[PDB]
Structure formats: C-alpha cells, structure tokens
C-alpha cells in the first residue's frame, strides 16, 4: 500500500477495524447492514429485524393493527426491544406520525409472528411518501439497493431474524441512525 513520494518522505496508510469498534464497547448500538440487494438487517438491543421489499401484502388494514402514534405499537409485540427498535427506525427514516399515512403491524395475540409493513409504493397518491421513505433509506443504508420501482407496488416488511454473522459491519449507517433518530 505504502510508497515513496520523495526519498525522505513516504506515503503511508492506516485502516480502522470495525470488528474492534463494535466488539470492544459495552453500549448496545444499533447495527444497520446490507447483506445483498434484497435483504437488509437492523439490530438493536435484543431485537433484530430482516427488512424486505416486495408486492406481497402480508398485512391488511381490515385485520391487522393500524399504527398512527408510537403508543399504538404496544399491541404489536411482547418484547419492548422490538417496539422500541421499530419506533426508532420509523423515526430515523423520517415518518411523520401526524401527517403521514399510518402503517401496519400484526397483533401480538396472533401467533404467526411479529412483523410490520409500510406501503412505500412509488405510485399515485403515495408517491410523495414513497420518495421521503426512499431518501431516509438512502441515509440509513450506505449504497442502499432501492428495490421499489416507479409506478409499481412495493410494500416493505420488517420481521424478526437471527443476525447474519456474515453481514458487513458499516459504522456510517450506525452514525446516521444515531443522528437522524433524534426527535
């Protein structure tokens, strides 16, 4: 890597280790990682979510819990970590609980599993919201692989998952999550 600029001066490099940065701290900091083009991951506390985007409406407004205010998420889960991570994520992406359309989560009394779903579709009357969300995802995920095409249906679902031990550690994502998370 190094080379000589003159005969007395030298070009040199230094690289930081993210393994040491995220291993030698006792603070539970949120991890945001991009495994591939279709699967994103976010860990916080004892909660860990796989985030995916596709046209499947896993939840429907008629049968599942409508979330309009963070407190409403009390019915989504029995683990406070999952509720807190979901609220923090929706805050970081830029969801306005006052003027933006409500989103959906599965009632905790049902046994399919925890999950929440945001429309995100870049079409029709949603196109503004879908843009903002996209922008948020570009801030939270470096090199964010946008999978939601224009004029198409593209619902996002976040569900529990075991953290991929092979996912790259990117601290820029954590920094953006901590900074944007303020409200």
């Amino acid at each position, epitope marked *: 890597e190094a080379f000589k600029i003159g005969l007395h001066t030298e070009f040199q490099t230094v690289s930081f280790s993210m393994v040491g940065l995220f291993s030698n701290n006792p603070h539970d900091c949120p991890l945001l990682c991009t495994l591939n083009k279709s699967h994103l991951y976010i860990k916080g506390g004892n909660a860990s979510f796989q985030i*995916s985007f*596709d046209d*499947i*409406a*896993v939840l*429907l407004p*008629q*049968y599942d819990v409508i979330i309009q205010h963070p407190a409403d998420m009390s019915w989504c889960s029995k683990s406070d970590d999952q509720i807190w991570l979901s609220q923090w994520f929706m805050n970081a992406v830029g969801h306005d609980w006052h003027l933006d359309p409500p989103f959906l989560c599965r009632n905790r*009394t*049902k*046994t*399919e*599993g925890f*999950i929440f779903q945001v429309n995100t579709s870049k079409t029709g009357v949603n196109e503004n919201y879908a843009k903002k969300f996209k922008t948020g995802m570009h801030h939270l995920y470096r090199e964010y692989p946008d999978s939601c095409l224009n004029g198409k249906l593209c619902l996002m*679902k976040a*569900q529990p998952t075991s953290w991929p031990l092979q996912c790259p550690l990117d601290h820029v994502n954590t920094l953006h999550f901590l900074t944007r998370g303020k409200n």
Partner: antibody, heavy 128, light 108 residues
C-alpha cells in the same frame, strides 16, 4: 422422510356425548421445535374447519383457538417427543368428524398459516 | 368469518383438457390464499400459496391467480391422477376458513 402420524391416546374414535378424548400426532423428519402445529377437522358433507394452533418456545408456546372450541379443547405439544396433542372435553354430536394435525412453515419468506404437511386423519364419532 | 365460496360443486373434464376452478371470498383477503388437493377424504396436499406461488413437488400443470376476492386455480393438460377434490383457503384473519370444495370428475 417427513412424517406426521395421528392416534387416539385412550380408547377408540367412538365416544358418547359428554366424554373426553385426547388425540395425539407424532412427527419425524424435521426439527419439531421450530414449526407451528395446527389441529383441524372435516365433518361429513361440511367443509374443513380450523380448530387450533400452537407455536414454538420463542413465543411461549402460545395457542389460538376457534370460538366454538374455546374452553372445551386444549392444544399442547411435547418437543422432546416431537408430538402435538389435542384434548377434547364435553364432546357433542356436532364434533363428529375426521381430525387432522398439520404443520405450517414459511412461504415466500414470510410466516403464514398454509399447511404444507398433514396427518393421515383420525375419525371421531360422537353418538349415544 | 370469511366465507370462501366455490359455486361449482362438481366439474367434468377429459384427459388433456384445461380446467379452471374458481373461489370467491366474502371479504378482501389480498393474496393470502392457498389451494389444496384431496383424494377420498385422505390427507390434503398443498398446491398453491400466496395465491400464485406453486409449492415444491407440484407439477407445473397447476397454476393459480387472483388478488382481492376472486381466485382461480388452473390445471392445464389434466391427467387421470389430477381427478380429485380441490379447495381454497384464506389465512388473512382468524379463524382460518376453507372453501366448500370442487370435485373434478371424468367426462363421458
């Protein structure tokens, strides 16, 4: 081989109105503790009816029932024996049907209650 | 409760034809629909899930479609082994409900 075999724990499938009856269903070929298990029934002439579901240890072995069996039926599971059980109390003549145990998995990357494996069926007749 | 309506109790066909069994939900269930096959009241067989995705091991003669309330299972190039009962199911809400059924019989 994925295998789900049902059985009647005590006695036969013919019971009188008012008695109890415990169906069992033993499995092999998959990690039983990772999958959610359902009990259903098919009455003669009538359509298939969902009865109960029980989930895994991560969700505290939670259970859900249809309204008509709530308080009478109880779904349980023994992960060490890879078995799911349905205890039916205060049996009525309307409970006469072919009962099935079933497994639900993950589909297109999302957990749903489509049944990918079923038991062979246990005929239960409640009559005086 | 959601009512899954299969108005055709019986449907005749010949080996090689194309057959289409319909199902109509009393409520909007999106694509949370599965299609099952059953013979002689034995253990059912999962054929379709998420309204349009074929289960592994099912021949490619079976396709399916629909979104909302109207769902259709289609069997192209029907075989003798395909003569059975077919029914839909919704899993969008509790209780899970199934269709009345449609028996596929042989044209004669």
């Amino acid at each position: 081989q994925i295998q789900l075999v049902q059985s009647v724990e005590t006695g036969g499938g013919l019971v009188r109105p008012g008695n109890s009856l415990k169906l069992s269903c033993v499995t092999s070929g998959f990690t039983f503790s990772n999958y959610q298990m359902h009990w259903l029934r098919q009455p003669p002439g009538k359509r298939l009816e969902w009865i109960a579901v029980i989930t895994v240890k991560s969700d505290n072995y939670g259970a859900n029932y249809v309204e008509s069996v709530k308080g009478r039926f109880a779904i349980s599971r023994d992960d060490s024996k890879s078995s799911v059980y349905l205890e039916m109390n205060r049996l009525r003549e309307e409970d006469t049907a072919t009962y099935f145990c079933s497994r639900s998995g993950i589909y297109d990357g999302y957990y749903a209650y489509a049944m990918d494996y079923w038991g062979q069926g246990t005929s239960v007749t409640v009559s005086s | 409760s959601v009512v899954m309506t299969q108005s055709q109790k019986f449907m005749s066909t010949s080996v090689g034809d194309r057959v289409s069994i319909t199902c109509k939900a009393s409520q909007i269930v999106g694509t949370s629909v599965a299609w099952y096959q059953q013979k002689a009241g034995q253990s059912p067989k999962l054929l379709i899930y998420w309204a349009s995705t074929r289960h592994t091991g099912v021949p490619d003669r079976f396709t399916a479609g629909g979104s909302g309330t109207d769902f259709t299972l289609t069997i192209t190039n029907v075989q003798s082994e395909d003569l059975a009962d077919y029914f839909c199911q919704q899993y969008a809400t509790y209780p899970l409900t199934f269709g009345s059924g449609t028996k596929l019989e042989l044209k004669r």
